Amino acid sequence: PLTEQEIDELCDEWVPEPLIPPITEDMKHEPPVLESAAGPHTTVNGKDVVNFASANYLGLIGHEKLLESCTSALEKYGVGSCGPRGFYGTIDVHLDCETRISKFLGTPDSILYSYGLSTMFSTIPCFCKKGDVIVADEGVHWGIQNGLQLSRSTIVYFKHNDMESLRITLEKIMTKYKRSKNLRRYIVAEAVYQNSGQIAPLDEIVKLKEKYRFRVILDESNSFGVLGRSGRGLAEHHSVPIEKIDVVTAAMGHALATEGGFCTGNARIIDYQRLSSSGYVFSASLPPYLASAAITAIDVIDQNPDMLVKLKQNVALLWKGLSDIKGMSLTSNRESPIVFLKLEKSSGSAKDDLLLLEKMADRALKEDSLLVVSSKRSFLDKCRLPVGIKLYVSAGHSESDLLKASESLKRLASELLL
Amino acid sequence: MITIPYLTAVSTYFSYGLLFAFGQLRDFFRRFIDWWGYAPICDFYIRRLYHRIQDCFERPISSAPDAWFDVVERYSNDNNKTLKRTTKTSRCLNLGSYNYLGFGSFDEYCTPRVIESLKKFSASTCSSRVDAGTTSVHAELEECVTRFVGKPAAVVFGMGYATNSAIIPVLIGKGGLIISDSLNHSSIVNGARGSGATIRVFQHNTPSHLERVLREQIAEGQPRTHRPWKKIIVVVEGIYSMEGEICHLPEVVAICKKYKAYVYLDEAHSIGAIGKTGKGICELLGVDTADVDVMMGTFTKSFGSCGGYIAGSKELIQYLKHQCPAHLYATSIPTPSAQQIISAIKVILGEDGSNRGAQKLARIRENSNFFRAELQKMGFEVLGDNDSPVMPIMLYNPAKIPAFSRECLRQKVAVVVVGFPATPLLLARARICISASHSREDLIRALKVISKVGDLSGIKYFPAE
Amino acid sequence: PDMNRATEWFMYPGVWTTYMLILFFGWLVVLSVSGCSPGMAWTVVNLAHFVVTYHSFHWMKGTPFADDQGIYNGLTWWEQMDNGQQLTRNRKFLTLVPVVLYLIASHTTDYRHPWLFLNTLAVMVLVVAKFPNMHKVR
Amino acid sequence: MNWVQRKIYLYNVTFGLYMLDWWERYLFNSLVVVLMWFVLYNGTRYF
Amino acid sequence: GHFFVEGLLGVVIIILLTRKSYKPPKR
Ligand SMILES: *Cc1c(COP(=O)(O)O)cnc(C)c1O
Secondary structure, three states: OOOHHHHHHHOOOOOOOOOOOOOOOOOOOOOOOEOOOOOOOOOEOOOOOOOOOOOOOOOOOOOHHHHHHHHHHHHHHOOOOOOEOOOOOOEHHHHHHHHHHHHHHOOOEOOEEOOHHHHHHHHHHHHOOOOOEEOOOOOOOHHHHHHHHHOOOEEOOOOOOOHHHHHHHHHHHHHHOOOOOOOOEEEEEEOEOOOOOOEOOHHHHHHHHHHHOOEEEEEOOOOOOOOOOOOOOHHHHOOOOOOOOOEEEEEOOOOOOOOOEEEEEOHHHHHHHHHHOOOOOOOEOOOHHHHHHHHHHHHHHHOOOHHHHHHHHHHHHHHHHHOOOOOEEEOOOOOOOOOOEEEOOOOOOHHHHHHHHHHHHHHHHHHHOOOOEEOOOOOOOOOOOOOEEEOOOOOOOOHHHHHHHHHHHHHHHHHHHO | OOOOOHHHHHHHHHHHHHHHHHHHHHHHHHHHHHHOOOOOOOOHHHHHHHHHOOOOOOOOEOOOOOOOOOEEEEEOOOOOOOOEEEEEEOOOOEOOOOOOOOOOOOOOOHHHHHHHHHHHHOOOOOOEOOOOOOEHHHHHHHHHHHHHHOOOEEEEEOOHHHHHHHHHHHHOOOOOEEEEEOOOOHHHHHHHHOOOOEEEEEOOOOHHHHHHHHHHHHHOOOOOOOOOOOOEEEEOOOEOOOOOOEOOHHHHHHHHOOOOOEEEEEEOOOOOOOOOOOOOHHHHOOOOOOOOOEEEEOOHHHHOOOOEEEEEOHHHHHHHHHHOHHHHOOEOOOHHHHHHHHHHHHHHOOOOOOOOOOOHHHHHHHHHHHHHHHHHHHOOOOOOOOOOOEEEEEOOOOOHHHHHHHHHHHOOOEOOEOOOOOOOOOOOEEEEEOOOOOOHHHHHHHHHHHHHHHHHHOOOOOOOO | OOOOOOOOOOOOOOHHHHHHHHHHHHHHHHHHHOOOOHHHHHHHHHHHHHHHHHHHHHHOOOOOOOOOOOOOOOOOHHHHHHHHOOOOHHHHHHHHHHHHHHHHHHHOOOOOOHHHHHHHHHHHHHHHHOOOOOOOOO | OOHHHHHHHHHHHHOOOOOOOHHHHHHHHHHHHHHHHHHHHHHHHHO | OHHHHHHHHHHHHHHHHHOOOOOOOOO
């Protein structure tokens, strides 16, 4: 064996790497520190921009009912709950909000989470163990594909919004694991994608799920309250009895203008989740004023359908204007409220193109005052869907600002990209 | 670390054996009578233990956390299965939620400012922090945290657990090691896994043992390929909750600068409580705040808000700002919570005017020290060090938990008891936690009540006085 | 540490006793409840125990906790003890107990027959289970 | 609360017989009494 | 014959006790 004298040098001429790679130059580019409500027409640097990167499709930011409800809850409740929901973190407003969400969608019971990304990750690890099978979708954002990694199951991706590949993958899976017959089989999907902005077709997913006894885990956070005919979700859109889906998740950051997210499903699932999750039994609870704002927003959505319709027309109009753009082309679904623009004929290494997009967005803000958002990936995000600039069109946008947006986009893009 | 009386150990083992045995009987007859298209997700442990005790958890309240809050009564209907919080409520004593400095209610300085900022910027904004989630309040928050923690930079997140789970993958990866500590938060454990790093463990702040593992591990080269690893990170916590005990800083720091390992402090429970000024453990134990490379904390347990932060070298903050997933993807921290953090730090630093915040620390010192000394005197088994405001009393049996919790509730005192899976088998705590909002009278009352209940349940393990 | 809630509890002061005390108790109660000779009680004890432990250790594959997803998805409890550090003191005790049980339960019924054959079989299988070589092997 | 009462209760909670349902408690209660009967009668005859 | 089994098992306990712990091997 080794001697105690020998170990001393082996622990002496070892030398570790620096904690972080050296800072380069690209890294410093400041966000636009802005001073107002981040509504449609916010203000930054004392100028007056037209916001297009804030995800409040329904335009509930600044509404007065949310203001008054939050004021009253803040006065009588404080700002924090100070404990995890397992010990003494359950205020009455939390249970009222859960009952309200369940009544909205239509479901036995619900649950609330303290943070948006939290839902995704806690939920997926709670529902699939070491030996299961998951058929993911290759376009799932980081939140979903962190939970997919945490639950040490067997993940098998398929093409982005391709049902032929879904059928082929399902048949292959049935061939592979024919003998053993106990494993559960999930299909993690997403209503409207952040990376591409196209709507999943749920009719065919349901049909293939029935034939092969799989289960769905749908993340409808960009469709809840915006997509359907009344705001119920994707189910309305593709009109399917909503207990077909087994788990439905959402984040309340976008439409409801509050924080945290929920996870709706039948009783069984729900209780299970409730007692043996990880981002629920260990973390603190939502501050009660956020839950109060959430309830107020849900009722406002429920009793005011006109904005839903209005939103759809607004997106229509934007598409109409951007239709004729030379350098780069729309690649999103005609209805979804994310007007994704994908650049054509990529120059080369993706770093150069992404820097090109950042320069374009910065130029847009500096010259025409029009905040937009250009896709950004870490070195931990494994998406390989093309980069581009997104546009979170909303219901509070006039025609004039919209119009102007297209105009500016067009001009800048064409000239700089050609 | 813990003195286990013999007959108590034997009784604990026998009682758990008896539960497992009735459990089995019940389950098997259920099954047989059951036998007389998607696979089912669901059982034994949860069903048995939790159903026997589930009126002691998730108690809903109907007011703000305070010294005295009101607890909702809850009836069970068809035999002990779904407790339905009805109407009608009590009025307890808050020995549950931690809010050390008493910041979760409504004082004069913070709440009007928070309301005004809510009116100006409205609830939450709608984006991430790179695009449109950066308001002036966030900038003020970052400067205040930088000036209050000490280190040259900081970034604030929206959730502590998310903070750890999204930051640990960034710093270390495939080919690195994480000598964690035996008991930590689960988020840190998860964070470790989130990457491809091997996870070793030393033994609760016995630096000697850390030294041995460290040397040994460094020799042993890699796992089974014998390359040298590229990074080693040592994760510790400021005051280890549910054990009371505080951390051995100077020792650990010198051992970590022996063998070129990196440090990762976690001062969640101890960023507002301990400190002659209220700075944490780096002020209490006199450790220079440059020998640690990352400090993570949480605004929940002391400031009455909901967030989480990272402070470190000014290079590390830029690297995280450009590569941390929970910075690029997640929605920014709500504005009212940001300005409450600002207001609370302004109060602690004595930047609000009169000397209100200069005596909250004085209050917590007296309260914690007097309560801990008295519980020691009466004959209990309170754990921990001498000036951290957590003092878990210790029970050791499963049936002792419903008895103690229910008795305390009946005499209008709310506590928090921790069961089997969250602990080892034998160790069954019931952790009190003092605030700088309890008055002398309330502490006297709770001492009388806990003494009566301990007399009636036989938990005065150490000799009386 | 052992970092496993389901197998680390076999290390605190007292476990070894409890065990004996439970068996002793078992004997007592069985003979008392219905008239039996001590040898009958010990055989009744031995087979009871055979069933009890053999099932648990050697057929319960997995863990009940959801802390770790499935990282011990298939390993009998006996395969998880002491983190697979074969032939440690705890393992030696768990192996030793059936031997003393067999010896006394056979002796006190001084090898007649029905009982003797039953227990022969018993101890046999239990000892077979263990064995250092036999590991992760059907 | 009386001496015997107190004792009963304390013993109940030590041996984990608090959380069982009445019948489980009943059954287990009895067993010890049977045991004792057996022992004293046997002791009587053995001495 | 009691003696043979008892003696064999006695040396059995001796064998099991006298041995020593050892890790399983790698690949
Ligand atoms: C209490 C505690 C938390 C709680 O975090 P929140 O996100 O504020 O709920 C996280 N980590 C550690 C180490 C803790 O002690």
